[PDB]
Amino acid sequence: IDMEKSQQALVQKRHYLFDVQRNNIAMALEVTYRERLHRVYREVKNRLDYHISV
Amino acid sequence: LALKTIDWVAFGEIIPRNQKAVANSLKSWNETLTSRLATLPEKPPAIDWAYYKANVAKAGLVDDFEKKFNALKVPIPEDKYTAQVDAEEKEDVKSCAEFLTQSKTRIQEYEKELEKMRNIIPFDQMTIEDLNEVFPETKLDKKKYPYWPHRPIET
């Protein structure tokens, strides 16, 4: 009886895995977003630094 | 950017032994990417267009690129992994439909047998047939041992 009850309780958290998956993938997309922003900023500043140094 | 709470110990009880390896691999993905995000800041700062134009004697290239930059817009990545959600629901089916009712009936059974235990009369009241039907394992299966005592004597 109690083993079955334990399985029933374990069912409740049966979704957490996909919650984790979603969090990870979404935040990875956010990572790509943010790094793209920082990289474009970097490139523009570098390109203008070229001419400043000139 | 909505990140939710987790009790990873319970999570670890989730996956069958087969996919546990990839489960922990993606867990490591999670932690590493979390830290990596913690590293970089929220926003690339503003470009000092005024200072650049000041020092940069170049005729218009300064504000040229200023304007062009300000016009340019980044490609935000698009949700494409974001598809396996039915997994949850179909997993929900396996646990909440395909396992809920089967476990439920297993219980109702076990309940019934249990309550069928307290109703057993005290042994003083009982009689060999009482044991026979209560515990069929106490039967003497005469069909295999039609002669007395119906069990191998050494048994």
Curated annotation (Swiss-Prot), chain A:
Entry's transmembrane regions: none
Superkingdom classification of source: Eukaryota
Disulfide bonds listed in the record: none
Residues with PTM N6-acetyllysine: 5, 13
Location in or out of the cell: Mitochondrion; Mitochondrion inner membrane
Cited function: Subunit b, of the mitochondrial membrane ATP synthase complex (F(1)F(0) ATP synthase or Complex V) that produces ATP from ADP in the presence of a proton gradient across the membrane which is generated by electron transport complexes of the respiratory chain. ATP synthase complex consist of a soluble F(1) head domain - the catalytic core - and a membrane F(1) domain - the membrane proton channel. These two domains are linked by a central stalk rotating inside the F(1) region and a stationary peripheral stalk.
Family: Belongs to the eukaryotic ATPase B chain family.
Complexes and interactors: Component of the ATP synthase complex composed at least of ATP5F1A/subunit alpha, ATP5F1B/subunit beta, ATP5MC1/subunit c (homooctomer), MT-ATP6/subunit a, MT-ATP8/subunit 8, ATP5ME/subunit e, ATP5MF/subunit f, ATP5MG/subunit g, ATP5MK/subunit k, ATP5MJ/subunit j, ATP5F1C/subunit gamma, ATP5F1D/subunit delta, ATP5F1E/subunit epsilon, ATP5PF/subunit F6, ATP5PB/subunit b, ATP5PD/subunit d, ATP5PO/subunit OSCP.
Protein name: ATP synthase peripheral stalk subunit b, mitochondrial
Parent-protein start and end of this portion: 150 to 203 of 256
Curated annotation (Swiss-Prot), chain B:
Domain of life assignment: Eukaryota
Gene Ontology, cellular component aspect: mitochondrial inner membrane; mitochondrion; proton-transporting ATP synthase complex
Modified residues (N6-succinyllysine): 73, 80, 90, 139, 144
Gene Ontology biological process: proton motive force-driven ATP synthesis; proton motive force-driven mitochondrial ATP synthesis
Pfam families: Mt_ATP-synt_D
SUPFAM superfamilies: ATP synthase D chain-like
Sites of N6-acetyllysine modification: 27, 43, 58, 67, 73, 80, 90, 112, 139, 144
Role, per record: Subunit d, of the mitochondrial membrane ATP synthase complex (F(1)F(0) ATP synthase or Complex V) that produces ATP from ADP in the presence of a proton gradient across the membrane which is generated by electron transport complexes of the respiratory chain. ATP synthase complex consist of a soluble F(1) head domain - the catalytic core - and a membrane F(1) domain - the membrane proton channel. These two domains are linked by a central stalk rotating inside the F(1) region and a stationary peripheral stalk.
Record's protein name: ATP synthase peripheral stalk subunit d, mitochondrial
Species of origin: Bos taurus (Bovine)
